[PDB]
Design a protein around this ligand. Structure first.
Ligand SMILES: *[C@@H]1O[C@H](CO)[C@@H](O[C@@H]2O[C@H](CO)[C@@H](O[C@@H]3O[C@H](CO[C@H]4O[C@H](CO)[C@@H](O)[C@H](O[C@H]5O[C@H](CO)[C@@H](O)[C@H](O)[C@@H]5O[C@H]5O[C@H](CO)[C@@H](O)[C@H](O)[C@@H]5O)[C@@H]4O)[C@@H](O)[C@H](O[C@H]4O[C@H](CO)[C@@H](O)[C@H](O)[C@@H]4O[C@H]4O[C@H](CO)[C@@H](O)[C@H](O)[C@@H]4O)[C@@H]3O)[C@H](O)[C@H]2NC(C)=O)[C@H](O)[C@H]1NC(C)=O
Ligand SMILES: Cc1cc(OCc2n[nH]c(=O)n2C(C)C)c(C(C)(C)C)cc1C#N
Ligand SMILES: [Ca+2]
Ligand SMILES: [Ca+2]
Ligand code: NA
Ligand code: NA
Ligand SMILES: [Zn+2]
Length: 806
């Protein structure tokens, strides 16, 4: 209940929420049905529109007007934004040449440059170039400030998850806003776009920027604007807040526009009708910048122009229906559209079975436009599993398509031509970033980066300490003129052991065999050197990875590769090798097909054994350093050491073998040599973080050999590919993957075909950032390079997307 008989007199767009025995005059009031009786009259004036005209100049103040053109308006802080242009002969901000902003030029009493976040819904990255002719204000922000060719949103590429990710620096699985629609089974409650449950604070996790600011003494304007408040009034409200006295004035502000998303849904991303919404958004920018210029703030405020996601062509006729796949369609609840989420309709239904639904949905029609996954099997780069509000069964929908439960949901619920929500690496889902102001660089283009990184930067811009988040703080230092954040490398927690030869062959009883008893100070001194690390500089190019948790492990050196061998998991944590452009691929000789060799540096008790694989009817083994890439017949024996072996399902070995035999050499040819670091990952609770030894759910039968959930590889070379990977003088180039270790290839519908037709496609789907591997392994890579630490942080956040040109 609201006693709506209080008044908004002098309270319009008040910053403090009065929620208890009072009517409200803030932005949330409409949404709560709690506005004072006179809120529209006082706070949403529209009389005479938004622009001064010559005849209005020096008018007598009329408090009824939406905005003012009288002489007192500047000191009142409520002129129309074009006031100085129309009445005082000034130019529009857009018409002024750009001039570098080398230092902030702020009015007295400003303690710091304010930050304004200007967020636009559904603003697809290519609009910056494609719509440039009709967006002169945005074009000036972009060309004069710092811009990326595009910014990668989070999955799902929906509004609420992306705007809250911008505000928190967190993945959706961590902030809790995992969709525009959600069911939370612990609360037994539903979150929807319409209605009031979405305002309950229990949905919204982490710490958003306005709370971070407030806790550290920095005031914030509203981030939420009621849909019915016209954009011109939103801008006037920000500009009025900027004229408050110092002790009351906020330092951080957000504007939000529902456009171009709103029209894009109706017309598609490039519908002829889209030109007008782009023009209108540019006009709003122009109003803001004109307004800042009037207040003498246009060379003091940092402005971020930023989207939440793009927009793709999607129409009703491109809908797959679960009713064409499942017999039991009425026993499920689908969250539909550009992603699908499935759970049981009734928790009292015990003939509900995830396994049969997944199977009924797997490769059932030739050009099937969605792929079903148990959430823990989704590409790890999505980070979309560790939340009870994410249903176990997920459908990844192909771009340009929808999924729905049955046909009647599509016509009895074609309207639309655009939609979004797809995999966040899809080119049409990419959105925009421009930063303009004293703290941003001048005329600078930066590479594409992910929106999870911006929270840290916004905290930098405001002198705030960010709450713990998923950005990598310092990875976006190259956007900034000043206020950089100078991170230090984390300290190594575990130091390695460096074992020498300590065991005789007969101490091992691993049930392994090798035809290796085939017989020189020339070559013998040389092989002793290799085991001591004499080739280590060739194979370990960026220093050894640091182990950032407590564990027991050994560095093992070989002619062709170096490894960090875990005495706890009985296998390497990492294996590092370089393959030059000139390297040759060879086969596994016939006599070595089943060869596994004890490693006399590592005890029987810390070794895998071959009998466990013999007895495990489902499990085979692979090697981390590939025997196919051995530098000589004699070096090849090292590849069969029991310390290079890892458990692999036969189905996964198809993928692994093709990577090692064919792809590594292809990459070395293309990139002028590559350095490769491969290893296992254990994430049985799908939290994106390295498992402890007591979280491992599966072992090779009858043993203590843990089964990885994933295998990764990090493939590094010289950005200037005229230099070979092992003699690179400047910046690095990287691509990486985290392949799921699955007992079938059901994910790959063409897997009965030759690996050349499906393996690399699988690996592209599972592309990853080095940082993702860091979280999953507790390792820290690239510790010894000639590059600055911030540049290395940027490299660690790189994702190789395999999408073509934006
Ligand atoms: C992305 O960045 C983020 C942030 O840095 C990373 O997330 C952090 O990861 C930590 C490890 O998973 C996690 O630490 C745990 O915190 C527990 C206390 O949690 C509460 O308090 C914090 C602080 O304010 C708050 O942020 C939390 O908010 C979560 O939960 C609420 C309500 O559910 C949500 O509103 C919110 O969205 C958020 O949910 C997310 O996280 C939780 C896990 O915290 C998930 O369940 C959700 O799915 C969702 O993703 C909380 O309100 C603390 O209790 C934990 O301590 C346990 O483990 C340690 C081992 O060190 C041990 O000392 C204790 O024994 C304890 O174990 C006991 O409980 C166990 C489990 O019940 C039980 O098995 C034992 O037997 C014991 O009794 C732990 O420290 C931290 O909370 C989150 N923070 C956030 C914001 O998510 C994220 O990892 C990054 N992602 C990647 C890929 O790097
Ligand atoms: C820039 C920004 C805007 C924003 O909300 C803008 C908004 N105004 N009106 C409206 O309906 N919306 C969205 C659609 C909910 C939010 C929320 C977390 C509050 C969603 C965060 C951030 C950030 N960072
Ligand atoms: Ca949106
Ligand atoms: Ca884990
Ligand atoms: Na086996
Ligand atoms: Na298959
Ligand atoms: Zn939309």
């Amino acid at each position: 209940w609201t006693a709506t008989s209080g008044s908004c007199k002098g309270r319009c767009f008040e910053l403090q929420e009065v929620g208890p025995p009072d009517c409200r005059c803030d932005n949330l009031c409409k949404s709560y049905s709690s506005c004072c009786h006179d809120f529209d009259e006082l706070c949403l004036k529209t009389a005479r529109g938004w622009e001064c005209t010559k005849d209005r100049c020096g008018e007598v103040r009329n408090e009824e007007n939406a905005c003012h053109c009288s002489e007192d308006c500047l000191s009142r802080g409520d002129c129309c934004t074009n006031y100085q242009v129309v009445c005082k002969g000034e130019s529009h901000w857009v018409d002024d040449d750009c001039e570098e902003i080398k230092v902030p030029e702020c009015p007295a009493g400003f303690v710091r440059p304010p930050l304004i976040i200007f967020s636009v819904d559904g603003f697809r990255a290519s609009y910056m170039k494609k719509g440039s002719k009709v967006m002169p204000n945005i074009e000036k922000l972009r060309s004069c400030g710092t811009h990326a060719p595009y910014m990668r949103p989070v999955y799902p590429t929906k509004t609420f998850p992306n705007l809250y990710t911008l505000a928190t620096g967190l993945y959706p699985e961590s902030h809790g806003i995992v969709g525009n629609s959600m069911y939370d089974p612990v609360f037994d409650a539903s979150f929807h776009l319409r209605g009031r449950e979405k305002f309950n604070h229990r949905w919204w996790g982490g710490q958003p920027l306005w709370i971070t600011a407030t806790k550290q003494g920095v005031r914030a304007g509203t981030f939420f604007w009621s849909v019915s408040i016209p954009h011109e009034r939103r801008i006037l409200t920000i500009l009025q807040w900027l004229s408050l006295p110092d002790n009351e004035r906020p330092s951080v502000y957000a504007f939000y526009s529902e456009q171009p998303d709103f029209s894009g849904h109706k017309y598609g991303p490039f519908g002829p009708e889209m030109t007008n919404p782009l023009r209108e958004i540019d006009k709003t920018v122009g109003q803001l910048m004109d307004g800042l210029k009037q207040l003498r703030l246009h060379r003091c405020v940092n402005v971020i122009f930023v989207g939440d996601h793009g927009m793709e062509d999607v129409t009703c006729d491109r809908t797959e229906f679960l009713s064409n796949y499942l017999t039991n369609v009425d026993d499920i609840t689908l969250v539909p559209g550009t992603l699908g989420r499935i759970r049981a309709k009734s928790i009292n239904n015990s003939k509900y079975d995830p396994k049969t639904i997944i199977a009924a949905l797997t490769c059932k029609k030739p050009d099937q436009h969605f792929k079903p996954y148990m959430k823990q099997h989704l590409p790890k780069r999505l980070h979309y599993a560790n939340n009870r509000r994410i249903e176990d069964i997920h459908l990844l929908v192909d771009r340009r398509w929808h999924v729905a439960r049955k046909p009647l949901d599509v016509y009895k619920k074609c309207f639309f031509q655009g939609d979004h929500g797809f995999d966040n690496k899809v080119n049409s889902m990419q959105t925009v970033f421009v930063g303009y102001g004293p703290t941003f660089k001048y005329r600078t283009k930066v590479p594409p980066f992910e929106n999870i990184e911006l929270y840290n930067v916004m905290c930098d811009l405001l002198g705030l300490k960010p709450a713990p988040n998923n950005g990598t703080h310092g990875s976006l230092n190259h956007l900034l003129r000043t206020n950089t954040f100078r991170p230090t490398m984390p300290d190594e927690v575990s130091r390695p052991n460096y074992p020498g030869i300590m065991y005789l062959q007969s101490e091992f009883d691993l049930g392994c065999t090798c035809d290796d008893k085939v017989e020189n100070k020339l070559e013998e001194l040389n092989k002793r050197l290799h085991t001591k690390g004499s080739t280590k500089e060739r194979h370990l190019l960026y220093g050894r990875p640091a182990v950032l948790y407590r564990t027991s492990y050994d560095i093992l050196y070989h002619t062709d590769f170096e490894s960090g061998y875990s005495e706890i998991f009985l296998m390497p944590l990492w294996t590092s090798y370089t393959i030059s452009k000139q390297a040759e691929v060879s086969s596994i000789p016939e006599h070595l097909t089943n060869c596994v060799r004890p490693d006399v540096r590592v005890s029987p008790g810390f070794s895998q054994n071959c009998l466990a694989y013999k007895n495990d009817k489902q499990m085979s083994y692979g090697f981390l350093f590939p025997p196919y890439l051995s530098s000589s017949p004699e070096a090849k024996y090292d590849a069969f050491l029991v310390t290079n072996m890892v458990p692999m399902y036969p189905a996964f070995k198809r993928v692994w073998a093709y990577f090692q035999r064919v792809l590594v050499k292809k990459y070395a040819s293309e990139r002028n040599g590559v350095n490769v670091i491969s290893g296992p990952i254990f994430d049985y609770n799908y939290d994106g973080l390295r498992d402890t030894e007591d979280e491992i759910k599966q072992y090779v039968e009858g043993s203590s050999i843990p089964v990885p959930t994933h295998y990764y590889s990090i493939i590094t070379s010289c950005l200037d590919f005229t230099q070979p990977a092992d003699k690179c003088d400047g910046p690095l180039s990287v691509s990486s993957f985290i392949l799921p270790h699955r007992p079938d290839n059901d994910e790959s519908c063409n897997s009965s075909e030759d690996e050349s037709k499906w393996v690399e496609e699988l690996m592209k789907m599972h592309t990853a950032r080095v940082r993702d591997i860091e979280h999953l392994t507790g390792l820290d890579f690239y510790r010894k390079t000639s590059r600055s630490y911030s540049e290395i942080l940027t490299l660690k956040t790189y994702l190789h997307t395999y999408e073509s040109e934006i």
